[PDB]
Design a protein around this ligand. Structure first.
Ligand code: AZA
Ligand code: AZA
Ligand code: AZA
Ligand code: AZA
Ligand code: CL
Ligand code: CL
Ligand code: CL
Ligand code: CL
Ligand code: NA
Ligand code: NA
Ligand code: NA
Ligand code: NA
Lengths: 295, 295, 295, 295
């Protein structure tokens, strides 16, 4: 037998960094969870018990903290690029570094209407993420995403005109609840290396902001014909607003809310126009996905 | 043998309710998870296979939705009281109803700076909860709480002067991170029944708001001597601001963030005054609890 | 205000211990998660920032590992007793120690039909637990339990003869699925202190074994009239087999499996006697509880 | 813009099936969670609100239950193939079906040493899974796996001889704990369609059994030089025992157990040869992956 593919490293590395402004007293915190997996001339660790080719995953962990100490950890696209570039440059025989970063929210508290200098709240489990693949000889591929953005609209969602055959029981509807957990990913043009990534640093926060804003506004304003149609509009707009993005991907569950017929109880009317109480369904759920690119 | 205690019912009942203002088009949503457990003359269901004394848990589920259809679901203290009162009044032989409600956040979205009439965001996994125990002959006991409120302050937390003996390795500190998940509970004076609960309806949202506000402000402003001392201040203030509360309980984990000594690497300084990168510890964690009452 | 109740300490302390038999080469592992919360003359830590009365939770963590190093960690009832007794004896001003222990399964692997000397498998997420409350002047109260024991029987479960009124839609059934996650707790006679606990050491593993055996056999053999009736039988038997137990508590969810009517599709028959495919319901679920004592 | 990729359907479809032997009274249960995502000429649902091309995900759910009613649900490789083949054959314009199945354990209980005819225990959260991609014109690609198989060996694991530089703090060790959650995947030769899958039905349970057996035996018997080296041996053997498998993939976390130096306390010796009490680390963890193919 032979090794067709291999990568190894340290996952679930929790990192916090604080920035203190000496002059203002304002402190800023960042918290993330980091995974770094390396590829290279490491097949003999698997086939021959040759650990000489292994950069220990414990050392990869140390390196993550040292890199956070010596560089900015924001935007996560830049940090991941610095981190991955380090491994392929430091170790001749390592030829790719795969860096995934989950950024956790720490939003400054407002106390009595004034931003507090050093207290924060996790104002959502929504995440901002990056996947940075640093490949020697082939630059840096970055996928940026937002995930865990949980939303609901109580009307202005429809689903009718779908295929109807002997497997179909679903009633057409012109007014339903739509609720989802948004997973949205924008894939950047390949970057030739760390300098090119750095040359675009401002665009990373800007594009994340645009993607979120477009997601929320389209979700709220689209009188939705379906999840499919709504998510395409989101993707289309994001592409139109950042030329350095090549594709936009959405992965959306349809978290169903079912009407409850109560007419069996004293003729209570709770369906159609009289629907007020619904049963949220934990499972199953629709799952709808789209990758949109430039025509 | 004999039954010393018994209660039974339906847990994890997910409920959504929408309120539509016909005139404005503004819709408002509520989502909760409900548990109702009943007590009464039901020992024979356990000892004699006598199911005649059982109100089926499926029927308790139906009753939850019907009650939500026919009454306000807010404040959760009132809904739980209505619900529990129904079971003990409807069924002679049922003498207590234990209603736990978890309220989930659905905060109206602001789109282009204007509140949207029917789109919402889950802007936190923080919960507002109630535990309502309706006991025939003995009124209604309500415990209200907030939970899952996750906060961090990056300085103005201290821990020194603790007991030091042969089991102690912890260094005293005058400047550390403090991060916790706030679980705060306020226990109301017994209410004689549903009318008395209704007579106090406005106080339920007001007291929840006060508890949150006092929690966040004390957390942010107290140069903390310890979790113990900070949480007591929170509780003291809440008691001072609502005379219908008898006790205030806090349950707080201390979610440790550890310094990382990196001086082994090129003499890097990352401790004490130079501490910038920390390792959040998932476990273990301190757990600190207090119940505060009136002197 | 004033402190009405207080306890504090370290939660989620993961502990592993290995026992190596030098002579046989057979190794045995134990893994648990420990929480120790202390009570005593500690009110001033909360009201006066007096940390002198605080045994740091970090030191409580150290003490957990030291105690595991110097004593047996099995049965967990004994370990918890040793641990809690240490705190109230070591610290004059500490008057109670509350020790919760979750034991994780590490079952020796059989390889080619022979037990392996040092490899183990987690052959279930089922837990064996103890709650040991050590109260100065008042001995040691122990609650032992098994939890997370997930079972299903595909027939020989019934539910009929329950109360029927205007809230009832549930059909009576003479043949249904019953599936639950067993949480079973046996509460021991108070022990006067550590010597008395030690005098009963063998009974702890024996009683845990009996409780599990009786649970599984009753579940499998009882043509169940209801969860209520079945769980009472379990409790009755356990009480009859260990006189040092005062009560037996069960907490059982009824994890419903619903029939699926498919006759709308080509007259397919999948209900009643023809029921083969069912939909497991994640929520809601019945929750049925009983505490049984001696008449 | 334009749709570069799209797939949609129903996730988290829980399914139970019972088989009753009329003659013996022996019943057998299967429980799984199913996801079916379809691809085809569906771009206009996204770009033009054309729902005519959508097979509703609700109908895909119905179809899952109907297929389970009318066919065997075991081995999961065959069920997934039947299910995916149905969609591409039934709907001209659907050209791929992606079926993921998670099988949940329901192992027959032994009561008083005899297998019970209709009671089962979930004797592990370990899963048996399939990923079946049915592509019109291109047959059926199946990946089979086991996951969630959690194991520990308390000695006969080593890690030394790794790369040492300025980022390295890890001590070499000749005797450590190794614990992991096994994720192992075997990828089958492409099948031309449903007949070819059926022609190999017996091999699916046999190969799953071999993979598990080889995993457990190698884990227990290999005096491991590293995770890398041990997992390669597992993969090598599995490939040697089933020629219809093209590759074998492992994904293994190294769930670290750290020594605890206690010599600061009364010179207690708990390291090296005296190590008995360890601290399991929840995070971070190494993550080691390998795909092995035929040379
Ligand atoms: O938006 C929707 N898209 C779908 O494909 C679908 N199928 N059922 N309900 C649905 N709703
Ligand atoms: O605030 C704190 N309280 C405690 O009791 C403690 N113990 N260790 N660290 C601590 N911090
Ligand atoms: O065993 C049961 N007990 C109950 O109380 C019940 N209620 N609905 N179904 C039930 N099944
Ligand atoms: O088996 C191991 N492999 C690795 O690559 C490694 N790195 N640190 N510890 C390790 N153990
Ligand atoms: Cl859907
Ligand atoms: Cl603490
Ligand atoms: Cl029930
Ligand atoms: Cl590792
Ligand atoms: Na390199
Ligand atoms: Na009553
Ligand atoms: Na004492
Ligand atoms: Na087709």
């Amino acid at each position: 037998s032979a090794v067709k593919a291999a990568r190894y490293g340290k996952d679930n590395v929790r990192v916090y960094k604080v920035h203190k402004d000496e002059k203002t007293g304002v402190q800023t915190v960042y918290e993330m969870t980091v995974c770094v997996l390396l590829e290279g001339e490491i097949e003999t660790s698997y086939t021959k018990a040759d650990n000489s080719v292994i950069v220990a995953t414990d050392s990869i962990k140390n390196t993550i903290y040292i890199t956070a100490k010596q560089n900015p950890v924001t935007p996560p696209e830049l940090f991941g690029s610095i981190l991955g570039t380090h491994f392929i440059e430091k170790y001749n025989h390592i030829h790719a570094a795969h860096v995934n970063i989950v950024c956790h929210r720490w939003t400054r508290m407002d106390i009595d209407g004034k931003p507090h200098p050093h207290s924060f709240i996790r104002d959502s489990e929504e995440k901002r993420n990056v996947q940075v693949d640093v490949v020697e000889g082939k630059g840096i591929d970055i996928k940026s995403s937002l995930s865990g953005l949980t939303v609901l609209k109580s009307t202005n969602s429809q689903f009718w005109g779908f295929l109807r055959d002997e497997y179909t029981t679903l009633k057409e509807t012109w007014d339903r609840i739509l609720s989802t957990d948004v997973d949205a990913t924008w894939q950047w043009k390949n970057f030739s290396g760390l300098q090119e990534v750095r040359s675009h640093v401002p665009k990373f926060d800007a594009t994340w902001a645009t993607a979120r804003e477009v997601t929320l506004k389209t979700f709220a304003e689209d009188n939705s014909a379906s999840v499919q149609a709504t998510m395409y509009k989101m993707a289309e707009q994001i592409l139109a607003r950042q030329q350095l993005i090549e594709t936009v991907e959405y992965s959306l569950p349809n978290k169903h809310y079912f009407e409850i017929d109560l007419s069996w109880h004293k003729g209570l009317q709770n369906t159609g126009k009289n629907a007020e109480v619904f049963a949220p369904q934990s499972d199953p759920n629709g799952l709808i996905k789209c990758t949109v690119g430039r025509s």
